[PDB]
Structure formats: structure tokens, C-alpha cells
Amino acid sequence: AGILFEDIFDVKDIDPEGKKFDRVSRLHCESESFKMDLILDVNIQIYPVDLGDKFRLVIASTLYEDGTLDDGEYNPTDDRPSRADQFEYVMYGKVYRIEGDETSTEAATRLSAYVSYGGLLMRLQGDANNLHGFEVDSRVYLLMKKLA
């Protein structure tokens, strides 16, 4: 299923400045063990999250799980992929920029990858090797599940 990155991240703040938009809150979290920060935005009403949670994040290239391209269509009745239904927050999306910190002479070692999920936004940032999978203009699913 092209899992592109995975970790159990930890919610270290829910809204650094203010509740700017009412039903969307920007969890700012630090992953444990790879030290990669996240700044996801989540629909609080349908996925209530609370401070201190540990969630499994699996930005995956495909939901189907058998490979194959999305076609980008809400094929509603399709169950044939038998995709990653285990997780409980699948937001779809796109990646808008893959900024980094490269001097002209050498490549960066702290790539930051801004990923846009339908207006709500995310910035996984961290060691270059881990985010190496991502590429610009690709649809990348975000899947999350809250783990005790």
C-alpha cells in the first residue's frame, strides 16, 4: 500500500495561537523516536482529539492496498480494493511544496514537506531520509488512528 511514512506521533499542543477557524484545530505534535514535527489540522467535531494523545500516522500513496492509481473519483460502492479501513481518519490531499534547507553546494538534511489536505493543511518536517518518499503534485492519503 505504498506506506510513505509512519510513526506514533504525540499531540503536544492543540492550538498555539487561537481558535482561528471554529471546527478546525491545528494539532502541533512531535513524533517520538524519529523526532519529526507535524502541524496537522483536523475536523474537531468528527475526530475529537485531546491534548497528549498518541496517534498512528500513515501518509500512504494508495488506500487500495493492492497497488494501482486512484483515478481521483469517489467510487462510492467500490469495496473491491478492501483498502486500509482499519484507520479512522482518512483525509485525502495533495503536496504543495517540498521545501528544504540546501546551500548551493550541498543537499539539505532537514527537508520540510508542506502537504495540503483539502484546504486544511499539514507540515511534516524532519530528517531528510524519512520524508524522502514524497514528491510535489501527488495525491497522498493521511490515515490516523488513536492508539492508547
Binding site: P16, E17, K20, F21, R26, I39, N43, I46, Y47, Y74, D85, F87, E88, Y89, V90, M91, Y92, G93, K94, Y96, R97, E99, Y114, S116, Y117, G118, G119, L120, L121, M122, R123, D137, Y141, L143
Partner: protein, 96 residues
């Protein structure tokens, strides 16, 4: 945009449907922080200003009179100078 919890589409997505063909435009919403551009969070915009329209899909940002209205560099003007006349008329009618 949100799938598993329930299928809920985002307004930006269904406004990226009225937008015609492919256009690249970046502008500021009427309420814009006078300092955000310089500091951190520049491209994740805490308040959703910085409309960016890349490829014909609003990727981020709220739309104001300057972004959608009668000013140089307005989303409407990008279309006339690239995409055309009839397509621009259809896009205006659909938005309304």
C-alpha cells in the same frame, strides 16, 4: 477531502471546480497579518490568508474582493489574459 469518519467535501474543493482550466495566481486576503510572511509558518498560514491557486485548484486561503473582484491581478483577470473570453463568462456565471 475527509473520507473515513464520514464523506465530507471541503469548500475549497468545490470552488476548484468552477475555476477554469489551469491558472497560477498568488494574492493576499483582505485580512492579512503584517508579519506572517517573514516568520515561521509562512507557507502553512495560521489564518488562511495567502490564496495560492496552483494548476486550477485553490490549494489554500480565503477569497476576498482583491482576490475575486475588479483589480489588477484578480483571479478573474488571470483568466482573461490566459484562458479566454467564453470560458471566463461561463466561470463567472457558475461561481455566481
Amino acid at each position: 477531502a475527509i473520507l473515513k469518519p464520514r464523506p465530507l467535501w471541503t469548500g475549497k474543493q468545490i470552488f476548484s471546480l468552477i475555476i477554469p482550466g489551469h491558472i497560477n495566481c498568488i494574492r493576499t486576503h483582505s485580512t492579512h497579518p503584517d508579519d506572517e510572511d517573514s516568520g515561521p509558518y509562512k507557507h502553512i498560514s495560521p489564518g488562511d490568508t495567502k490564496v495560492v491557486v496552483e494548476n486550477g485548484e485553490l490549494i489554500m486561503g480565503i477569497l476576498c474582493k482583491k482576490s475575486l473582484g475588479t483589480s489588477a491581478g484578480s483571479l478573474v483577470h488571470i483568466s482573461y489574459l490566459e484562458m479566454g473570453h467564453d470560458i471566463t463568462r461561463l466561470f463567472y456565471s457558475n461561481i455566481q
